[PDB]
Write an enzyme that holds these catalytic residues in place. Structure first.
Site, PDB file in Angstrom:
ATOM      1  CG  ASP A   1      47.691  44.534  37.054  1.00 23.94           C
ATOM      2  OD1 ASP A   1      48.001  44.100  38.182  1.00 23.94           O
ATOM      3  OD2 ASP A   1      47.049  45.588  36.885  1.00 23.94           O
TER       4      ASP A   1
ATOM      5  N   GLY B   1      55.076  40.134  54.043  1.00 23.20           N
ATOM      6  CA  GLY B   1      54.868  39.669  52.672  1.00 23.20           C
ATOM      7  C   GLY B   1      56.225  39.485  52.019  1.00 23.20           C
TER       8      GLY B   1
ATOM      9  CE  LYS C   1      44.960  47.869  36.379  1.00 23.90           C
ATOM     10  NZ  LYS C   1      46.199  48.161  37.145  1.00 23.90           N
TER      11      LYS C   1
ATOM     12  CG  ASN D   1      58.563  41.101  42.648  1.00 24.67           C
ATOM     13  OD1 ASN D   1      59.462  41.925  42.481  1.00 24.67           O
ATOM     14  ND2 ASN D   1      57.289  41.378  42.403  1.00 24.67           N
TER      15      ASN D   1
HETATM   16  N1  NDP Z   1      54.358  43.464  41.775  1.00 21.77           N
HETATM   17  C1  NDP Z   1      54.499  44.885  41.561  1.00 21.77           C
HETATM   18  O1  NDP Z   1      55.116  45.277  40.577  1.00 21.77           O
HETATM   19  C2  NDP Z   1      53.891  45.884  42.503  1.00 21.77           C
HETATM   20  C3  NDP Z   1      53.014  45.331  43.424  1.00 21.77           C
HETATM   21  N2  NDP Z   1      52.031  46.048  44.212  1.00 21.77           N
HETATM   22  C4  NDP Z   1      51.323  45.371  45.273  1.00 21.77           C
HETATM   23  O2  NDP Z   1      52.114  44.763  46.186  1.00 21.77           O
HETATM   24  C5  NDP Z   1      51.994  43.505  46.677  1.00 21.77           C
HETATM   25  C6  NDP Z   1      53.144  42.562  46.381  1.00 21.77           C
HETATM   26  O3  NDP Z   1      53.551  42.612  45.045  1.00 21.77           O
HETATM   27  P1  NDP Z   1      53.613  41.276  44.243  1.00 21.77           P
HETATM   28  O4  NDP Z   1      55.066  40.976  43.832  1.00 21.77           O
HETATM   29  O5  NDP Z   1      52.707  41.380  42.993  1.00 21.77           O
HETATM   30  O6  NDP Z   1      53.075  40.104  45.153  1.00 21.77           O
HETATM   31  P2  NDP Z   1      53.476  38.606  44.921  1.00 21.77           P
HETATM   32  O7  NDP Z   1      52.356  37.893  44.132  1.00 21.77           O
HETATM   33  O8  NDP Z   1      54.816  38.485  44.154  1.00 21.77           O
HETATM   34  O9  NDP Z   1      53.614  37.855  46.309  1.00 21.77           O
HETATM   35  C7  NDP Z   1      52.488  37.733  47.131  1.00 21.77           C
HETATM   36  C8  NDP Z   1      52.939  37.630  48.577  1.00 21.77           C
HETATM   37  O10 NDP Z   1      52.193  38.126  49.659  1.00 21.77           O
HETATM   38  C9  NDP Z   1      51.921  36.982  50.441  1.00 21.77           C
HETATM   39  N3  NDP Z   1      50.556  36.999  50.939  1.00 21.77           N
HETATM   40  C10 NDP Z   1      49.276  36.850  50.248  1.00 21.77           C
HETATM   41  N4  NDP Z   1      48.294  36.954  51.239  1.00 21.77           N
HETATM   42  C11 NDP Z   1      48.986  37.160  52.492  1.00 21.77           C
HETATM   43  C12 NDP Z   1      48.499  37.316  53.726  1.00 21.77           C
HETATM   44  N5  NDP Z   1      47.086  37.299  53.976  1.00 21.77           N
HETATM   45  N6  NDP Z   1      49.310  37.480  54.665  1.00 21.77           N
HETATM   46  C13 NDP Z   1      50.617  37.523  54.602  1.00 21.77           C
HETATM   47  N7  NDP Z   1      51.250  37.367  53.356  1.00 21.77           N
HETATM   48  C14 NDP Z   1      50.310  37.180  52.280  1.00 21.77           C
HETATM   49  C15 NDP Z   1      52.213  35.766  49.626  1.00 21.77           C
HETATM   50  O11 NDP Z   1      52.586  34.691  50.404  1.00 21.77           O
HETATM   51  P3  NDP Z   1      53.083  33.345  49.769  1.00 21.77           P
HETATM   52  O12 NDP Z   1      54.507  33.504  49.314  1.00 21.77           O
HETATM   53  O13 NDP Z   1      53.032  32.238  50.785  1.00 21.77           O
HETATM   54  O14 NDP Z   1      52.227  32.978  48.581  1.00 21.77           O
HETATM   55  C16 NDP Z   1      53.370  36.240  48.886  1.00 21.77           C
HETATM   56  O15 NDP Z   1      54.467  36.240  49.714  1.00 21.77           O
HETATM   57  C17 NDP Z   1      50.707  43.163  45.995  1.00 21.77           C
HETATM   58  O16 NDP Z   1      49.633  43.315  46.838  1.00 21.77           O
HETATM   59  C18 NDP Z   1      50.618  44.129  44.829  1.00 21.77           C
HETATM   60  O17 NDP Z   1      49.320  44.368  44.468  1.00 21.77           O
HETATM   61  C19 NDP Z   1      51.973  47.380  43.706  1.00 21.77           C
HETATM   62  C20 NDP Z   1      53.123  47.941  43.256  1.00 21.77           C
HETATM   63  C21 NDP Z   1      53.789  47.323  42.078  1.00 21.77           C
HETATM   64  O1  AKG Z   2      53.528  50.019  34.732  1.00 21.18           O
HETATM   65  C1  AKG Z   2      52.304  50.266  34.755  1.00 21.18           C
HETATM   66  O2  AKG Z   2      51.751  51.059  33.963  1.00 21.18           O
HETATM   67  C2  AKG Z   2      51.451  49.573  35.790  1.00 21.18           C
HETATM   68  C3  AKG Z   2      52.356  48.852  36.781  1.00 21.18           C
HETATM   69  C4  AKG Z   2      51.624  48.682  38.089  1.00 21.18           C
HETATM   70  O3  AKG Z   2      50.835  47.763  38.234  1.00 21.18           O
HETATM   71  C5  AKG Z   2      51.865  49.624  39.177  1.00 21.18           C
HETATM   72  O4  AKG Z   2      52.879  50.352  39.133  1.00 21.18           O
HETATM   73  O5  AKG Z   2      51.050  49.677  40.124  1.00 21.18           O
END
Ligand code: NDP
Ligand code: AKG
Length: 417
Positions: free
Chosen positions: A143, A217, A103, A220
């Site tokens: 990240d 949520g 990390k 993406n």
């Molecule tokens: N992105 C990735 O590759 C992966 C992600 N994760 C975890 O998964 C989740 C989603 O991924 P990610 O694409 O990065 O997230 P995003 O940043 O793309 O989107 C965030 C979303 O969650 C919503 N949100 C934030 N707070 C709340 C809440 N209190 N209640 C309801 N909805 C809320 C946001 O709403 P709004 O649209 O209104 O802003 C938005 O829709 C994250 O928590 C992430 O840590 C882990 C696996 C890999």
């Molecule tokens: O691809 C990686 O090494 C980290 C991606 C990531 O944030 C995850 O899969 O939780």
């Protein structure tokens, strides 16, 4: 309060309670094997020089080179980076990758940094942590508040420093497709979640064709999860939410239309033909699959008894508390552990690293098939451990990951017991 690392150690200790592991191995696993803290000086647009604090924690590399993303957040701490590296170790261990845990992070607010300043920050971070990273030593990744553009800048800086003496493409993943990128990176997490949901439905003996799914949520991950469920699994998307609110439709929803209406109106609220609802009552619909892909820790004692979902796919990073875990298990609800359900992203990152190392790049179909095989095998291993040991799914995933890491450590001779 509530120290991040300490919680990870506690969890590691709750996991070791369900398996046979020596004390020396547990003590080794409780400590990151290498922590690097460096100063990251960059030149600002006004000509001043500002120094930022950068981190690079390599928790364990018994199974191979460490893997983990880089976070650019103003609230980043060394404890958070250490805890996330520890979690990344188990994440790569459960899905059976030849990877360790790593990390990185920089204490910076990227919202107030220009493009040139961000590029300088990435290049200076690479110049600072070059001595502890490499294609076979430590592979960073995108990240929070970090995108593939920063990955390309970092890879270019690493290639410049290394003088093109090896596979500079493989030093970092999540790169743009023009430079060592991989197909299927955008939908990796959602695709893995869909594969685990299909495997869970197969395990429970239920058919997802024509069933109902609610996704909490709509980022993406959530949008792609809903779209892929509707397309491949044939399920009916019923309710989605943004940070603002949620919508409801018993006849079904089109994820593309919802996304189009979200970016146009800035939110999912007041979708035509749908009823406005709140996340708290959205988690309580009678559905077959619920996929929390949003803010962490949304299911607790207050709402655990009201969950009616047959399958809960923890796409987000730990949205269910351990007491809620116990309550849901008592109700006969199948939970996919958070670091197993969203393991598709790290698996596709591993595929990208393999492509960069090999010099040969695969197509979308090959990547999808390999991801399917890996995720199905990992989920079935976790479920078999669940059935055999009569423990929770999260516990079984912890058992599998820690057992793999412990076996790797014993094979190297690091621990003699
Ligand atoms: N992105 C990735 O590759 C992966 C992600 N994760 C975890 O998964 C989740 C989603 O991924 P990610 O694409 O990065 O997230 P995003 O940043 O793309 O989107 C965030 C979303 O969650 C919503 N949100 C934030 N707070 C709340 C809440 N209190 N209640 C309801 N909805 C809320 C946001 O709403 P709004 O649209 O209104 O802003 C938005 O829709 C994250 O928590 C992430 O840590 C882990 C696996 C890999
Ligand atoms: O691809 C990686 O090494 C980290 C991606 C990531 O944030 C995850 O899969 O939780």
């Amino acid at each position: 309060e509530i120290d991040p690392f300490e919680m990870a150690v506690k969890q590691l200790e709750r996991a070791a309670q369900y398996m046979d592991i020596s004390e020396e191995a547990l003590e080794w696993l409780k400590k990151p094997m290498r922590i690097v803290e460096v100063s990251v000086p960059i030149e600002m647009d006004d000509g001043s020089v500002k120094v930022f604090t950068g981190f690079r924690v390599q928790h364990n590399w018994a199974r191979g080179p460490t893997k983990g993303g880089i976070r650019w957040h103003p609230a980043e701490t060394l404890s958070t980076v250490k805890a996330l590296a520890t979690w990344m170790t188990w994440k790569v261990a459960v899905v059976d990758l030849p990877y360790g845990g790593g990390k990185g992070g920089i204490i910076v607010n990227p919202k107030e940094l220009s493009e040139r300043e961000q590029e300088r920050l990435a290049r200076a971070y690479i110049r600072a942590v070059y001595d502890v990273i490499g294609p076979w030593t430590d592979i960073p990744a995108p990240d929070v508040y970090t995108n593939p553009k920063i990955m390309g800048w970092m890879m270019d800086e690493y290639e410049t420093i290394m003088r093109r003496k090896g596979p500079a493409f493989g030093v970092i993943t999540g790169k743009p497709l023009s430079i060592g990128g991989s197909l299927g990176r955008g939908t990796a997490t959602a695709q893995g979640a869909i594969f685990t949901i299909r495997e869970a439905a197969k395990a429970l003996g239920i058919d997802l064709k024509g069933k109902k799914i609610a996704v909490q949520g709509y980022g993406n991950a959530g949008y792609y999860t809903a779209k892929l469920a509707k397309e491949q699994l044939g399920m009916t998307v019923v309710a989605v939410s943004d940070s603002r609110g949620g919508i409801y439709n018993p006849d079904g929803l089109d994820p593309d239309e919802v996304l189009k209406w979200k970016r146009e109106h800035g939110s999912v609220k007041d979708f035509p033909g749908a009823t406005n609802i709140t996340n708290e009552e959205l988690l309580e619909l009678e559905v077959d699959v619920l996929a929390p892909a949003a803010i962490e820790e949304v299911i607790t004692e207050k709402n655990a008894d009201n969950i009616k979902a047959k399958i809960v796919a923890e796409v987000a990073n730990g949205p269910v508390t351990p007491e809620a875990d116990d309550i849901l298990r008592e109700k006969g609800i199948l939970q996919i552990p958070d670091f197993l359900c969203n393991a598709g992203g790290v698996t596709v990152s591993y595929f990208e690293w393999v492509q960069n190392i090999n010099g040969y790049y695969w197509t979308e179909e090959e990547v999808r098939e390999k991801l399917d095989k890996k995720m199905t095998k990992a989920f079935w291993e976790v479920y078999n451990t669940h059935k055999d040991k009569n423990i929770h799914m999260r516990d079984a995933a912890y058992v599998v990951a820690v057992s793999r890491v412990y076996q790797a450590m014993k094979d190297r001779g690091w621990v003699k017991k």
